[PDB]
């Protein structure tokens, strides 16, 4: 029972879990009932959810995974915690290969987990091993990473992918867990139906929803002084502990470099210290604006895109302009409030940096149809921009709007964004920008 | 899990109405597909209006023009709008929630289909 889950996660990976829903994953792909889905992010607890489970199951365990370098990573951890794992790669000699196909062969072989590309998962060099393994009642799980692969929808679609469903469908007899970091709900969508995963499809994706951020979007049009209301912004921000006088950092995101320069300036004349980063100071600039920032020499960074970091006290991040994706602005954003005290994310919104934006995006979406033809997640980036779009131009509760996005059950607002907060200064402030178009 | 209700069924005369009103329960995200089915009396369960997320919607042709079928985003909910009634449609009316995600806000979800209980239809 829960009994052997404890100690074995004790016994071996030396633990309790990260999360209460890592552990519901974990239990759920060990019941061994039904295929499982686990949307976590770069964290790595999802790895616990298919490698833990490979050892109570007294049978073998095969990991689909694109790229070798994400393989290798594990592979060797997953050895010095004296454990029987193996990469099949065609980066590895005939000898070795040959050396594991036999062990593979084997009633009763040394691998418990066995990490392939889906290059060989496909080949027809490998299928009667697989067979053999599947006759003999050896294959405990099938695991896929990277599953939004299989999606054309998703950022980094694999033709190889498509050939996972049949695979799944041959291994009925074992439980099927597909593992991403990244999925909309229409890539989900793919996943289930492209891996021929069963149903119910249990499903363990984390939740984008932090209580201590505060989202709100200004609009640069219905307002006297932008600059003034950003300092005023960073003031509120800044100062949540007045007795330590300013406590706390922030950063500010622009699309253009002298955009940067400029409003690190107006910041600065304003009376809240900002530099500005961007790739067009040298190398040793950026290391040096980096450090003042790190070390609250200089309490605002002013960024493009390129910001490198992990701070615990960001106590605001403000987009000056439109992010070019939701995914971006929820990324960039929750740079914000690690530390789990509150903090500000507000979006300023101008049908001007739409339009600049919109067009960017279009502009080197067809940079890459030259580059390599026509690809449906050339829809998707448009897609990715238009709801951010969305987000900004609405009435509603602005982490709902988020929440829906990625595919996130309704969260638990508590006035925590300007629509809860207000709902009709929001009202106010759209109708005013339907009488300014 | 989740609960498919049917409501809004009885006994109406020939050329009369009725709207059917198909409720989902749990912690519904989206439905790929709901579909109604009749089951007449000694007859094949019959494909009857399907409506996808994003609202396309596709009718048999025993009941093109007569019905219609909606979806009530707000609430949840679906609508078969069935108007010029014949003994023909007599039948048990039930929905199909094909592509059924489900999530909390722990993070814990489902992704299944689900079947209706059913509401009869008597048309004199």
């Known amino acids: 029972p829960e009994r052997r889950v404890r100690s074995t996660l004790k016994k071996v990976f030396g633990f309790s879990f990260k999360t209460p829903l890592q552990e519901s994953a974990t239990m759920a792909v060990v019941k061994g009932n039904k295929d499982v889905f686990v949307c976590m992010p770069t964290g790595a607890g999802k790895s616990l959810c298919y490698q833990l489970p490979a050892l109570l199951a007294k049978g073998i365990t095969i990991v689909v995974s694109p790229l070798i370098a994400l393989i290798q990573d594990q592979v060797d951890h997953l050895l010095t915690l004296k454990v029987r794992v193996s990469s099949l790669n065609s980066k590895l000699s005939a000898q070795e290969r040959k050396e594991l196909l036999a062990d593979l062969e084997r009633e009763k072989p040394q691998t418990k987990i066995l990490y392939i590309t889906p290059e060989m998962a496909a080949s027809s060099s490998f299928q009667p091993t697989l067979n053999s393994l599947v006759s003999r009642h050896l294959l405990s799980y099938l695991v896929v990473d990277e599953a939004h692969c299989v999606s054309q929808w998703g950022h980094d679609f694999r033709p190889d992918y498509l050939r996972l469903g049949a695979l799944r469908s041959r291994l009925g007899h074992a439980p099927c867990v597909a593992l991403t970091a990244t999925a909309t709900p229409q890539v989900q969508e793919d996943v289930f139906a492209a891996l021929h995963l069963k149903k119910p499809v249990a499903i363990f994706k984390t939740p984008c929803f932090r209580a201590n951020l505060f989202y709100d979007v200004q609009f640069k049009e219905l307002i006297s002084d932008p600059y003034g209301n950003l300092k005023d912004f960073c003031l509120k921000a800044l100062g949540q502990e007045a007795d330590k006088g300013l406590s706390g950092c922030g950063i500010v995101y622009c699309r253009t470099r002298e955009a940067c320069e400029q409003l690190a300036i107006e910041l600065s004349c304003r009376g809240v210290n900002a530099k500005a980063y961007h790739a067009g100071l040298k190398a040793s600039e950026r290391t040096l604006v980096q450090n003042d920032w790190m070390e609250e020499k200089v309490p605002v960074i002013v960024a493009t895109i390129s910001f490198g970091v992990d701070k615990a006290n960001v106590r605001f991040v403000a987009h000056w302009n439109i992010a070019k994706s939701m995914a971006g602005y929820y990324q960039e954003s929750g740079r914000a409030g690690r530390d789990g005290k509150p903090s500000w994310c507000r979006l300023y919104y101008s049908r001007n940096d739409r339009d600049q934006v919109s067009f960017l995006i279009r502009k080197e979406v067809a940079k890459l149809q030259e580059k390599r033809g026509n690809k449906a997640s050339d829809k998707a980036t448009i897609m990715a921009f238009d709801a951010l779009v969305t987000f900004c131009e609405e009435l509603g509760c602005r982490h709902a709007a988020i929440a829906k996005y990625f595919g996130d059950a309704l969260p638990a607002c508590a006035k925590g964004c300007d629509h809860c907060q207000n709902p009709t200064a929001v009202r106010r402030r759209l109708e005013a920008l339907e009488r300014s178009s | 899990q989740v609960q498919l209700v049917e409501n809004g069924g009885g006994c109406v005369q020939a050329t009369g109405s009725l709207r059917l009103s198909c409720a989902a329960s749990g912690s519904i995200f989206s439905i790929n597909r709901m579909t109604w089915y009749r089951q007449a009396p000694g007859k094949e369960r019959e494909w009857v209006a399907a409506?996808?997320?994003?609202?396309?919607?596709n009718y048999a042709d025993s009941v093109k023009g007569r019905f219609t079928i909606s979806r009530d985003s707000a609430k949840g909910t679906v609508y078969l709008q069935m108007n010029s009634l014949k003994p023909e449609d007599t039948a048990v009316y039930y929905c199909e929630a094909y592509g059924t995600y489900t999530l909390a806000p722990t993070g814990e979800g489902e992704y299944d289909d689900y079947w209706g209980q059913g509401t009869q239809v008597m048309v004199s």
């Open positions: 409506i996808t997320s994003g609202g396309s919607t």
